[PDB]
């Protein structure tokens, strides 16, 4: 089987184009073909097309013909897919794959995010523990990490000391085009006021770093 190394995440405006690449590598005398596959929340997995790396013969899903163009650089053994006229429905993970008679391998995937949003660091709001957040000795508290772009943000508790019982929820995309998530932790009720709980937020794209204390 052929080893596949895909290019990095792309962030583009609607109407833009992107070129994705896939370095291939292997000691194999198996005849193989290269494929590209889309994975989106809206449509699941979809095959885009195939290309024979020995001669560049290509065959497409009619849905993607004109949207995608597949090529191979035989000197570098690199496969390329150019996607044009991008819209939000093109936001997805794109894989490059190999097939032989005895199976196939998939690249890591390249995320393409099509959006008009600019880079923006999050606001960080406490989710304060109270009587409404306590369940018989057990209290819940958290941080709301709101209105950032692009993904990801990282959240730790107590500068990484506190990992037990932490849930950092997947981010949601808001109708604004910005992301939001919450990170919560359950703790001993008795600890509140005594122990400090600080959520450490880092949004690398905007270089936004915030440590927020959460208390009643």
């Amino acid at each position: 089987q052929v080893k596949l190394q895909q290019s990095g995440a792309e962030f583009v405006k609607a109407g833009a184009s992107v070129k994705l690449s896939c370095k291939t590598s292997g000691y194999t005398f198996n005849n193989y073909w290269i494929h590209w596959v889309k994975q989106s929340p809206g449509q699941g997995l979809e095959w885009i097309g195939e290309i024979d790396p020995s001669d560049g013969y290509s065959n497409y899903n009619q849905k993607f013909k004109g949207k995608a163009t597949l090529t191979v650089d035989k000197s570098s053994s690199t496969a390329y897919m150019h996607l044009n006229s991008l819209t939000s429905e093109d936001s997805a993970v794109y894989y490059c794959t190999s097939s032989t008679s005895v199976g196939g391998s998939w690249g890591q995937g390249t995320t393409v995010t099509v959006s008009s949003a600019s880079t923006k660091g999050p606001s960080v709001f406490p989710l304060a523990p109270s009587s409404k957040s306590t369940s018989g000795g057990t209290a819940a508290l958290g941080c709301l990490v709101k209105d950032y772009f692009p993904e990801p943000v990282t959240v730790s508790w107590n500068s990484g000391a506190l990992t037990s019982g932490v849930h950092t929820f997947p981010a949601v995309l808001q109708s604004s085009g910005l992301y939001s998530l919450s990170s919560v932790v359950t703790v001993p009720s008795s600890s509140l006021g005594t122990q400090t709980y600080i959520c450490n937020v880092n949004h690398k794209p905007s270089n936004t770093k915030v440590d927020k204390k959460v208390e009643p």
């Binding site: 979809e46 097939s99 849930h167």
Partner: protein, 217 residues
């Protein structure tokens, strides 16, 4: 037009060690003119690409354990796991490459079954900090519940809210096999300040009745 591959079930709760079977039905025959049936099975683990398990109906891919096998017809197929291990949890996909365009099933989630666990429900009012920014987010947290299916409804002065909340769910916990869920209701501050009672009503299989957590401002 394109060949439709339908998987059953959608969600398959199992216990470690159990036998598991997933089916795939194709809207066309996948028997090729060369006599092979190009129906393949993949496992996608969280945050990874799909990985090939079974190819061309029943051939086990290099490196795949013997507990996986595939069988079937020209239109009806089954993937079997003789004894489920923790490494096997994830989303299983079938795929056909007999006919262009190649197509995929919608996926089957293999998860861990456990006894019913009702959620612990917690409600968080918006922070003063956020109210100063012009926005109000109220958060409802459903902690450590099973099964995953749950209904969360927001009531603001007894008015059902529709379209202004978003939900996010964790992956199944490695230790206790439960899920947690956040429901976030977002209002403009103007809207938020006109109302008194904020309530999340939670319905779940593990609860005798719906539970309501609320606060009054």
């Amino acid at each position: 037009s394109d060949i439709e591959l339908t998987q059953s079930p959608l969600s398959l709760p199992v216990s470690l060690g159990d036998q598991a079977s997933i089916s795939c039905t194709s809207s066309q025959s996948l028997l090729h003119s060369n006599g092979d049936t190009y129906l393949h099975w993949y496992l996608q683990k969280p945050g990874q690409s799909p990985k090939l398990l079974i190819y061309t109906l029943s051939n086990r891919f290099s490196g795949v354990p013997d507990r996986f096998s595939g069988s079937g017809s020209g239109t009806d197929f089954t993937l079997k796991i003789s004894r489920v291990e923790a490494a096997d949890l994830g989303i299983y996909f079938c795929s056909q490459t007999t006919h262009v365009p190649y197509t995929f099933g919608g996926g089957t989630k293999l998860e861990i079954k456990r006894a019913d666990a009702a959620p612990s429900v917690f409600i968080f009012p918006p922070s003063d900090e956020q109210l100063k920014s012009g926005t109000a987010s109220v958060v409802c947290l459903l902690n450590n519940f099973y099964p995953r299916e749950a209904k969360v409804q927001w009531k603001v002065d007894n008015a059902l809210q529709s379209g202004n909340s978003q939900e996010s769910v964790t992956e199944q916990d490695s230790k206790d096999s439960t899920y947690s869920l956040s429901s976030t209701l977002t209002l403009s501050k103007a809207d938020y300040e006109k109302h008194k009672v904020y309530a999340c009503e939670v319905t779940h299989q593990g609860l005798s009745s719906p539970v309501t957590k609320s606060f009054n401002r």
